[PDB]
Enzyme design. Structure first.
Site, mmCIF file in Angstrom:
data_model
loop_
_atom_site.group_PDB
_atom_site.id
_atom_site.type_symbol
_atom_site.label_atom_id
_atom_site.label_comp_id
_atom_site.label_asym_id
_atom_site.label_seq_id
_atom_site.Cartn_x
_atom_site.Cartn_y
_atom_site.Cartn_z
ATOM 1 N N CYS A 1 34.603 -69.859 -10.989
ATOM 2 C CA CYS A 1 35.997 -70.256 -10.872
ATOM 3 C C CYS A 1 36.811 -69.030 -10.510
ATOM 4 O O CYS A 1 36.754 -68.018 -11.211
ATOM 5 C CB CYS A 1 36.508 -70.898 -12.167
ATOM 6 S SG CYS A 1 38.192 -71.452 -12.045
ATOM 7 N N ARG B 1 40.680 -68.272 -12.781
ATOM 8 C CA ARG B 1 40.547 -68.015 -14.212
ATOM 9 C C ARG B 1 41.677 -67.179 -14.799
ATOM 10 O O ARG B 1 41.734 -67.037 -16.020
ATOM 11 C CB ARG B 1 39.226 -67.347 -14.534
ATOM 12 C CG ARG B 1 38.098 -68.346 -14.654
ATOM 13 C CD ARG B 1 36.769 -67.682 -14.970
ATOM 14 N NE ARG B 1 36.243 -66.973 -13.814
ATOM 15 C CZ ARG B 1 35.273 -66.072 -13.876
ATOM 16 N NH1 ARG B 1 34.750 -65.759 -15.051
ATOM 17 N NH2 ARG B 1 34.829 -65.488 -12.763
ATOM 18 N N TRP C 1 45.362 -77.013 -10.621
ATOM 19 C CA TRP C 1 45.886 -77.309 -9.305
ATOM 20 C C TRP C 1 44.913 -76.778 -8.247
ATOM 21 O O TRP C 1 43.928 -76.076 -8.531
ATOM 22 C CB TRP C 1 47.287 -76.726 -9.134
ATOM 23 C CG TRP C 1 47.312 -75.308 -9.512
ATOM 24 C CD1 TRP C 1 47.018 -74.251 -8.712
ATOM 25 C CD2 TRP C 1 47.602 -74.768 -10.802
ATOM 26 N NE1 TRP C 1 47.118 -73.080 -9.414
ATOM 27 C CE2 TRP C 1 47.472 -73.370 -10.704
ATOM 28 C CE3 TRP C 1 47.965 -75.327 -12.027
ATOM 29 C CZ2 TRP C 1 47.696 -72.520 -11.780
ATOM 30 C CZ3 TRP C 1 48.183 -74.484 -13.102
ATOM 31 C CH2 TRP C 1 48.051 -73.094 -12.969
ATOM 32 N N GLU D 1 40.115 -75.855 -0.568
ATOM 33 C CA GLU D 1 39.238 -76.852 -1.155
ATOM 34 C C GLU D 1 39.439 -78.204 -0.490
ATOM 35 O O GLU D 1 38.490 -78.988 -0.374
ATOM 36 C CB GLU D 1 39.493 -76.969 -2.646
ATOM 37 C CG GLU D 1 39.457 -75.678 -3.425
ATOM 38 C CD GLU D 1 39.712 -75.930 -4.900
ATOM 39 O OE1 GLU D 1 38.857 -76.564 -5.543
ATOM 40 O OE2 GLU D 1 40.777 -75.539 -5.401
HETATM 41 C C1 HEM Z 1 44.315 -73.978 -12.332
HETATM 42 C C2 HEM Z 1 43.874 -73.842 -11.073
HETATM 43 C C3 HEM Z 1 42.373 -73.749 -10.665
HETATM 44 C C4 HEM Z 1 41.957 -73.358 -9.458
HETATM 45 C C5 HEM Z 1 42.850 -72.920 -8.278
HETATM 46 C C6 HEM Z 1 40.520 -73.407 -9.424
HETATM 47 C C7 HEM Z 1 39.743 -73.079 -8.334
HETATM 48 C C8 HEM Z 1 38.379 -73.228 -8.326
HETATM 49 C C9 HEM Z 1 37.506 -73.183 -7.172
HETATM 50 C C10 HEM Z 1 37.934 -72.958 -5.705
HETATM 51 C C11 HEM Z 1 36.254 -73.362 -7.599
HETATM 52 C C12 HEM Z 1 35.022 -73.371 -6.658
HETATM 53 C C13 HEM Z 1 34.320 -74.724 -6.643
HETATM 54 C C14 HEM Z 1 34.500 -75.377 -5.303
HETATM 55 O O1 HEM Z 1 35.192 -74.797 -4.427
HETATM 56 O O2 HEM Z 1 33.945 -76.485 -5.111
HETATM 57 C C15 HEM Z 1 36.287 -73.543 -9.054
HETATM 58 C C16 HEM Z 1 35.220 -73.741 -9.902
HETATM 59 C C17 HEM Z 1 35.229 -74.033 -11.238
HETATM 60 N N1 HEM Z 1 36.351 -74.279 -12.018
HETATM 61 FE FE1 HEM Z 1 38.149 -73.735 -11.476
HETATM 62 N N2 HEM Z 1 40.073 -73.846 -10.661
HETATM 63 C C18 HEM Z 1 41.200 -74.062 -11.456
HETATM 64 C C19 HEM Z 1 41.198 -74.514 -12.762
HETATM 65 C C20 HEM Z 1 40.129 -74.763 -13.595
HETATM 66 C C21 HEM Z 1 40.198 -75.271 -14.951
HETATM 67 C C22 HEM Z 1 41.505 -75.634 -15.671
HETATM 68 C C23 HEM Z 1 38.947 -75.381 -15.410
HETATM 69 C C24 HEM Z 1 38.451 -75.840 -16.803
HETATM 70 C C25 HEM Z 1 39.191 -75.755 -17.912
HETATM 71 C C26 HEM Z 1 38.059 -74.927 -14.357
HETATM 72 C C27 HEM Z 1 36.695 -74.864 -14.390
HETATM 73 C C28 HEM Z 1 35.915 -74.556 -13.299
HETATM 74 C C29 HEM Z 1 34.475 -74.462 -13.320
HETATM 75 C C30 HEM Z 1 33.618 -74.694 -14.589
HETATM 76 C C31 HEM Z 1 34.052 -74.158 -12.079
HETATM 77 C C32 HEM Z 1 32.588 -73.910 -11.627
HETATM 78 C C33 HEM Z 1 31.740 -75.085 -11.143
HETATM 79 C C34 HEM Z 1 30.288 -74.632 -11.180
HETATM 80 O O3 HEM Z 1 29.920 -73.675 -11.930
HETATM 81 O O4 HEM Z 1 29.471 -75.223 -10.437
HETATM 82 N N3 HEM Z 1 38.811 -74.557 -13.277
HETATM 83 N N4 HEM Z 1 37.600 -73.446 -9.453
HETATM 84 C C1 LIG Z 2 39.922 -77.797 -12.371
HETATM 85 C C2 LIG Z 2 39.619 -77.444 -10.945
HETATM 86 C C3 LIG Z 2 40.622 -77.037 -10.082
HETATM 87 C C4 LIG Z 2 40.316 -76.744 -8.763
HETATM 88 N N1 LIG Z 2 41.249 -76.360 -7.876
HETATM 89 N N2 LIG Z 2 39.067 -76.848 -8.341
HETATM 90 C C5 LIG Z 2 38.072 -77.239 -9.151
HETATM 91 C C6 LIG Z 2 36.682 -77.330 -8.559
HETATM 92 O O1 LIG Z 2 35.694 -77.278 -9.571
HETATM 93 C C7 LIG Z 2 34.447 -77.726 -9.282
HETATM 94 C C8 LIG Z 2 34.134 -78.081 -7.979
HETATM 95 C C9 LIG Z 2 32.859 -78.539 -7.688
HETATM 96 C C10 LIG Z 2 32.540 -78.926 -6.262
HETATM 97 C C11 LIG Z 2 31.047 -78.786 -5.994
HETATM 98 N N3 LIG Z 2 30.653 -79.656 -4.879
HETATM 99 C C12 LIG Z 2 29.230 -79.998 -5.025
HETATM 100 C C13 LIG Z 2 31.454 -80.895 -4.887
HETATM 101 C C14 LIG Z 2 31.908 -78.636 -8.705
HETATM 102 C C15 LIG Z 2 32.250 -78.274 -10.005
HETATM 103 F F1 LIG Z 2 31.392 -78.343 -11.026
HETATM 104 C C16 LIG Z 2 33.508 -77.824 -10.285
HETATM 105 F F2 LIG Z 2 33.788 -77.486 -11.546
HETATM 106 C C17 LIG Z 2 38.325 -77.552 -10.482
#
Ligand code: HEM
Ligand SMILES: Cc1cc(N)nc(COc2cc(CCN(C)C)cc(F)c2F)c1
Ligand code: HEM
Ligand SMILES: Cc1cc(N)nc(COc2cc(CCN(C)C)cc(F)c2F)c1
Ligand SMILES: C[C@H](O)[C@H](O)[C@H]1CNc2nc(N)[nH]c(=O)c2N1
Ligand SMILES: C[C@H](O)[C@H](O)[C@H]1CNc2nc(N)[nH]c(=O)c2N1
Ligand SMILES: [Zn+2]
Lengths: 418, 414
Positions: B110, B113, B282, B287
């Site tokens: 993420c 964070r 958000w 994305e």
């Molecule tokens: C608040 C704005 C947030 C933004 C801009 C953001 C952005 C992102 C992005 C770009 C990814 C990459 C995954 C993808 O592109 O498909 C990601 C992954 C992830 N986000 Fe965040 N996120 C946000 C909030 C959160 C929140 C609130 C949580 C949980 C409380 C969270 C948990 C995760 C986790 C666990 C992943 C990893 C998925 C994996 O390990 O496969 N995110 N986030």
């Molecule tokens: C809260 C939040 C905000 C944000 N802006 N973006 C995200 C994206 O989080 C994830 C995205 C993917 C896509 C992986 N693909 C195979 C579809 C898999 C995950 F396990 C995630 F946690 C989460």
């Protein structure tokens, strides 16, 4: 066995080749260093001359692998060759590669380069044996011929020139240049920088070594060659051998007036070639550019040419905030120009869509015939438009095979002069 | 025993001592690196659960500067009492909020964070039915969406017990458009969600068979068969995508939802497993704009936009794909800002994440990061994370993946 999946086509490859991995990646099962530049100092033998039980086992392995390559394991020539390496090492503490062994190992170092997207071409390398060289002048003759042959009036051909192997370390052959052709970088009086800022330290070594600098933006740098450990020596590459492409735009007439150009020959010259325990500290190699190397990194890194803000101005772009994507938008037009210029001057060049597609095909080929292909996703994925290229969605196993190309310290940090 | 990481652009050097703490496997070995593998490699008895519990309570009381205290030692004894007699235990509200916040904080993939500490945690451990889950999730959405000024939130449902009475949101995100395969092989809507669309329709959902149909919630409570619920339309904030320069862009008819809400992940705290735990923040622009709209397995509007740009779509070296892609992401950011819907672009987000990384090194001793996931999927090199080395390891509490419920659930009707 370890499978790899392509998340766009669902093709799954099954890697067994990783089992012949010798060196540490830097990763442990508790921590992954896949994004570290140099994750591991695990070489294969001490820094200067190794003992017999240190060198022969590496030698025995390579000779084994090479004879096994040509379907002659345990043959007359194979058994004779081991005994021959045995006696050489006995009486010289090193051994000399046969001509064919040299070519096999050089091509296979390129083949296991986990970072090279351009590897589909690996068996088409041209090997120039410079192992008879004794001086910087001779090093300059060999390099000059390399550049003429490789450049081929714009129809670029891949080549490597291999200077004598390391003996004790205080008698190294080095190219002090990181690439054979780089522009200079000058630390301006007002704190700014003219030319290529990566090359300021080297541009100053050249000045302090005697070089009359033209103090411009695209001054081709002198070669700085070290032979048999002695003090290095400045030579000027005849300009008629440095093929250069002025950059214009197929649409924006104003683009040429930026007075930008780049050289057409990418020739890495500061790395170490490792075959059967032998260390070739001078092995310049060249191919052709993927557009992005010039137009993304060389032109648009902050620590490099930083033409982004300049190109965006002429584009009339709202640069007040980032959410306009004025950097993204100019980055594309720059890499459009860079390609259109090279193709217009018939200088070999490949775009990031064509090259990544090839590497997917190269992976296939490799997995099908070799049982695997080492691949460093962090370096294979081009630095622009990542996900709209196939490599992005492709799982890649990374592991270290020998022969290979190794980093090595810049010779000026470790060279007591005369 | 320290580990250093370098920024090859700025040349800042950070010292990582946090990696010693981790105890979960990355997937790599000493001789192979698996850093590009999407997924590398019933439930725990009493004896595995004691140390995990001790671990978590220890790290929690340390964070509130109360390690070794009476409250710390009594809590441990209490936790053992529970596992010793019910084979599980129950988190305190304080620990549940701490755990949830740190699972986010520990999400090496993420980029967003820097806001980990501002999570709003909604306890739903009292829920018992799918209707209860729908209510809780509706409140989540109304709260998180906040008329466009989005706020980060998680809703935590009852923990796993025997792996047979499991709560799940079958939905992968709480808001996703539907996708239908047509007779002719063409696909209408989001092709990612085609299989899920079929699962819904089969369970009674009556599809509009349009391009942007909000899917229904498929909500499983206590290991029972899941149930269909239509989110109230007035709670799904949506953004019509237009372009500041290209008038014709609105005619593409594209829109997207404003609330990114991941729902198929498992939240692991102290050895407890929270198999339904939807969370939301958000959006970063790319994305939607690179992956949602331009992936080949997805909405694939690259072909269509480049036509309406008169770009030469023959040879690739014209970079028509790159050129259209930027425009689409220009459009997706412009559209959100105008409707005053929260959104961050990839430049601003990576910027922030480097600041976050540096701060986490200072106070905490490191920050696990997955450069493969942190670097945006367009213009990677011109974002500072590209030139930033990152150590990757697995700290708990964490968000894990889990198999899709329809692959492992055993049904009951007729
Ligand atoms: C608040 C704005 C947030 C933004 C801009 C953001 C952005 C992102 C992005 C770009 C990814 C990459 C995954 C993808 O592109 O498909 C990601 C992954 C992830 N986000 Fe965040 N996120 C946000 C909030 C959160 C929140 C609130 C949580 C949980 C409380 C969270 C948990 C995760 C986790 C666990 C992943 C990893 C998925 C994996 O390990 O496969 N995110 N986030
Ligand atoms: C809260 C939040 C905000 C944000 N802006 N973006 C995200 C994206 O989080 C994830 C995205 C993917 C896509 C992986 N693909 C195979 C579809 C898999 C995950 F396990 C995630 F946690 C989460
Ligand atoms: C022929 C066309 C070639 C292309 C398009 C190409 C492209 C690339 C690119 C893009 C990289 C990533 C590094 C960077 O961006 O600067 C790379 C790395 C590399 N390439 Fe190639 N290359 C080519 C030929 C060759 C040849 C001929 C050799 C050697 C004979 C070679 C050996 C290497 C090595 C050793 C690395 C880096 C490995 C490391 O750092 O550990 N490449 N190449
Ligand atoms: C033959 C060839 C062709 C081509 N088109 N491109 C290349 C790029 O070669 C390298 C570039 C870097 C830059 C790494 N950075 C720390 C400065 C490090 C290496 F080890 C390389 F081999 C090579
Ligand atoms: C920190 C990061 O590992 C570093 O910037 C890497 C990323 N990937 C790269 N990829 C290529 N092709 N070339 C590079 O120099 C780098 N640099
Ligand atoms: C194969 C490769 O690991 C895969 O395509 C990854 C790369 N990085 C990613 N990064 C993000 N943010 N999201 C993704 O889906 C992926 N996919
Ligand atoms: Zn790794």
């Amino acid at each position: 066995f370890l499978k790899v999946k392509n998340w766009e086509t669902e093709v799954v490859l099954t890697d067994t080749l990783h089992l012949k991995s010798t060196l540490e990646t830097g990763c442990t099962e508790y921590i992954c260093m896949g994004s570290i530049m140099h994750p591991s100092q695990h070489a294969r033998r001490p820094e200067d001359v190794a003992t017999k039980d240190q060198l022969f086992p590496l030698a025995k392995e390579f000779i084994d692998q090479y004879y096994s390559s040509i379907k002659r394991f345990g043959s007359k020539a194979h058994m004779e060759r081991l005994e021959e390496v045995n006696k050489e090492i006995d009486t010289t503490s090193t051994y000399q590669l046969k001509d064919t062994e040299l070519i096999y190992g050089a091509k296979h170092a390129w083949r296991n380069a986990s970072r090279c997207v351009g590897r589909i071409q690996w068996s088409k390398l041209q090997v120039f044996d410079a192992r008879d060289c004794t001086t910087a002048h001779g090093m300059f003759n060999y390099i000059c011929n390399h550049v003429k042959y490789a450049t081929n009036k714009g129809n670029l051909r891949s080549a490597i020139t291999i200077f004598p192997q390391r003996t004790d370390g205080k008698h190294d052959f080095r190219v002090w240049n990181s690439q054979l052709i780089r522009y200079a970088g000058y630390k301006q009086p007002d704190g700014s920088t003219l030319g290529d800022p990566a090359n300021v330290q080297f541009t100053e070594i050249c000045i302090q070594q005697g070089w009359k600098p033209p103090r411009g933006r695209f001054d081709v740098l002198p070669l700085l060659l070290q032979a048999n450990g002695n003090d290095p020596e400045l030579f000027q590459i005849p300009p008629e051998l440095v093929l250069e492409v002025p950059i214009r735009h197929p649409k924006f007439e104003w683009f040429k007036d930026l007075g930008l150009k780049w050289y057409g020959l990418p020739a890495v010259s500061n790395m170490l070639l490792e075959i059967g325990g032998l260390e070739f500290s001078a092995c310049p190699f060249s191919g052709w550019y993927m557009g992005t190397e010039i137009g993304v990194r060389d032109y648009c890194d902050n620590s490099r040419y930083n033409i982004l803000e300049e190109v965006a101005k002429k584009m009339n772009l709202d640069m007040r905030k980032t959410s306009s994507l004025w950097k993204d938008q100019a980055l594309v037009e720059i890499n459009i120009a860079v390609l259109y210029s090279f193709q217009s001057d018939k200088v070999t060049i490949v775009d990031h869509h064509s090259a990544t597609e090839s590497f997917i095909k190269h992976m296939e080929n490799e997995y099908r015939c070799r049982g695997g292909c080492p691949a460093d996703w962090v370096w294979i994925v081009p630095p622009m438009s990542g996900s709209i290229t196939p490599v992005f969605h492709q799982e890649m196993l990374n592991y270290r095979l020998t022969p290979s190309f190794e980093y090595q310290p810049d010779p000026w940090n470790t060279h007591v002069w005369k």
